[PDB]
Structure 1
Amino acid sequence: VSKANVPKIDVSPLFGDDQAAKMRVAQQIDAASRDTGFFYAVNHGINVQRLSQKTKEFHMSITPEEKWDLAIRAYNKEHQDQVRAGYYLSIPGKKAVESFCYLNPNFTPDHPRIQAKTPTHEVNVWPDETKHPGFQDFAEQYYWDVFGLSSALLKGYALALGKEENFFARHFKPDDTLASVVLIRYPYLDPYPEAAIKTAADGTKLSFEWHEDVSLITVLYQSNVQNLQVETAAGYQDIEADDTGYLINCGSYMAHLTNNYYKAPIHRVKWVNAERQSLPFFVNLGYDSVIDPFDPREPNGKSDREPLSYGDYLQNGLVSLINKNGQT
């Protein structure tokens, strides 16, 4: 098994006003997006230290009672409004991973999308503050820290594609973004239940099967345990871990709107028996956001693809990923 070329790109110019330096970042984003589809964003300005410090613990201190009380509807029929946000329980002997998903903190009962009961919008659920002091504050703060990094990255992608820097970011707004954070725990287990291990066609033991991400881009922090592989024509290649950087890739909404010029890389999660964290931020637009497709391979830039509303894209994609790769 070979190793994927995953360049480390200093993204710090994307926060500044040196326009040629921003173009030199954009060139690197373009090159990576046309190669394996992954890069590490470094010099990103976020305190990923601990982000990790916490997150395993939140993880290491929630009880079964609290898990049921926060569980999504797949695990708790009483919680019919929790499709996306809440706790995703492990099933000892069967399913090792567990996770906690939250959405835009601005989705409250006052928000018109909550009032209208629009699909994919939910009010976040949180544990008791006294049992988990500082957790909600940390998690909401983190959402906006990674929102800020993601905005800057979106400026890089726009410039890489020959657009003005706000081409994507103008649709990525605190008042309506459908972006989500997931705090994932992958446990060490001895014995590890074979029922929680999948076998790929090529024989590789996996925790999560091949997929394209449902996102515009995905902005991922993981602890220092190698696990991800990306598909290339020559087969799957290992993505090296880097617990100081953010691993970035495009999702299928980007592939759609660029006429597949920036493909959504197919990737999977190898099985590794080690305690680790996987903390994605899925960069989603607003429910009504529409980006007009274009084809940067064509002299006239024109695409015949239909502009997709982001919310309907997300509703279709999240359901499809559950059906194909299982309830997480």
Structure 2
Amino acid sequence: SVSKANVPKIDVSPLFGDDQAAKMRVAQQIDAASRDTGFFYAVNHGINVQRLSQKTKEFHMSITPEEKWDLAIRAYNKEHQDQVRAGYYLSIPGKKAVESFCYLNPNFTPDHPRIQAKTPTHEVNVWPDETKHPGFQDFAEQYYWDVFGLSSALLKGYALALGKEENFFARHFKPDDTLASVVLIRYPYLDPYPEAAIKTAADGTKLSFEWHEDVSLITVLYQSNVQNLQVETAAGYQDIEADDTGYLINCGSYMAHLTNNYYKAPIHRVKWVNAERQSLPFFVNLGYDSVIDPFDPREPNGKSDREPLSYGDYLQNGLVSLINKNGQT
């Protein structure tokens, strides 16, 4: 009885080029999707997602329990007090099925000014031993830059869609300072699948991750071809079809803040599925001190009754709140 959500496939390739008319026609499609269910698939995006999937699989299936402790975030290993965001997020057999590896901007090096200053939300990535995972760090860092590139193009489309100049968001999304993250999530097949690792929604649906708005400007997501996501709409939660050739795009709550809820952050959740699969989000985050002045594209003077919020304030508050609401991942 759970209807397919309207999730259009938008050819985003004009956003990489210089045909302004064509870009406006893509922006209209982004506007439409953003006003409807809040999701679309970006197609013709130029990223080799099959290779991303293969390299990620090789990592997930070769990492050992020893390596996971050695890379673990603070929530799992008290010795790693600097690792709030970046590192390994362990499963707990019998209790918690999902496990993952998160990394941040590769430019956050020991000498980076924000690392020196110890500013919250900035960390130096941790990586497994190169000889045990040959090529993995290099692949993963290049992937960061490939999806950064796609996200910059998408941000040009969102800006045009909102009646702005195309750099309105992108000017704040910079290699030297972006707080964006990649998460390489493994969802396992388990037989038996422990009930303790399954949540139940109010409507009785079995879930792996509860309802939420994303903490992002936008989210740029690759998933395996196994249906799992649902979006809350007015006729109920609806199934978002999988498409392992496309990137699933949606707004996060910073976009809702900037646009005075004209582009809402859609509410969505992750169904429980007993399948070995991947979920690989890129969270498009700005710089720590990036402030965009809020506006309202439904009002004649564009004025909004929201206050400016720096991205760093937003992000630290949001990530902590999401862990309190929906649990440590």
TM normalised by structure 1 equals 1.00
Q: CA deviation at 1:269?
A: 0.1
Q: 1:242-279 deviations in whole A, cap 9, x for unaligned?
A: 00000000000000000000000000000000000000
Structure 1 residue 76 corresponds to structure 2 residue 77: yes
Query: What is the DSSP-based 3-state SS (H/G/I as helix, E as strand, rest coil) of the residue aligned with 1:230?
Result: strand
Q: CA deviation at 1:304?
A: 1.7
Q: 1:4-44 deviations in whole A, cap 9, x for unaligned?
A: 00000000000000000000000000000000000000000
Query: What is the DSSP-based 3-state SS (H/G/I as helix, E as strand, rest coil) of the residue aligned with 2:68?
Result: helix
Aligned to 1:280: 281
Q: 1:52-71 deviations in whole A, cap 9, x for unaligned?
A: 00202200001111000000
Structure 1 residue 29 corresponds to structure 2 residue 30: yes
Between the aligned partners of 1:57 and 1:7, the Cα distance in structure 2 is 31
Between the aligned partners of 1:14 and 1:137, the Cα distance in structure 2 is 27
Between the aligned partners of 2:325 and 2:108, the Cα distance in structure 1 is 29
Q: CA deviation at 1:197?
A: 0.2
Between the aligned partners of 1:286 and 1:135, the Cα distance in structure 2 is 26
Q: CA deviation at 1:50?
A: 2.1
Between the aligned partners of 2:51 and 2:21, the Cα distance in structure 1 is 34
Between the aligned partners of 1:299 and 1:118, the Cα distance in structure 2 is 39
Between the aligned partners of 2:283 and 2:198, the Cα distance in structure 1 is 25
Between the aligned partners of 1:46 and 1:32, the Cα distance in structure 2 is 22
Q: CA deviation at 1:140?
A: 0.1
Query: What is the DSSP-based 3-state SS (H/G/I as helix, E as strand, rest coil) of the residue aligned with 1:308?
Result: coil
Between the aligned partners of 1:47 and 1:281, the Cα distance in structure 2 is 15
Aligned to 1:295: 296
Between the aligned partners of 2:267 and 2:210, the Cα distance in structure 1 is 10
Between the aligned partners of 1:289 and 1:232, the Cα distance in structure 2 is 31
Between the aligned partners of 1:154 and 1:28, the Cα distance in structure 2 is 13
Q: 1:290-315 deviations in whole A, cap 9, x for unaligned?
A: 00000000011111210110001000
Query: What is the DSSP-based 3-state SS (H/G/I as helix, E as strand, rest coil) of the residue aligned with 2:62?
Result: coil
Between the aligned partners of 2:319 and 2:62, the Cα distance in structure 1 is 29
Q: 1:88-121 deviations in whole A, cap 9, x for unaligned?
A: 0000000000000000000011101000000000
Q: CA deviation at 1:233?
A: 1.6
Between the aligned partners of 2:167 and 2:124, the Cα distance in structure 1 is 28
Between the aligned partners of 1:293 and 1:233, the Cα distance in structure 2 is 26
Aligned to 1:265: 266
Query: What is the DSSP-based 3-state SS (H/G/I as helix, E as strand, rest coil) of the residue aligned with 1:184?
Result: strand
Is the deviation greater in 264-273 or in 52-61? 52-61
TM normalised by structure 2 equals 0.99
Between the aligned partners of 2:295 and 2:219, the Cα distance in structure 1 is 21
**Equivalent residues, number:** 328
Between the aligned partners of 1:54 and 1:195, the Cα distance in structure 2 is 30
Between the aligned partners of 1:150 and 1:17, the Cα distance in structure 2 is 17
Between the aligned partners of 1:158 and 1:185, the Cα distance in structure 2 is 33
Unaligned runs of 5+ in 1: none
Between the aligned partners of 1:44 and 1:63, the Cα distance in structure 2 is 33
Q: CA deviation at 1:219?
A: 0.1
Q: CA deviation at 1:234?
A: 1.5
**What percent of counterpart residues are identical?**
100
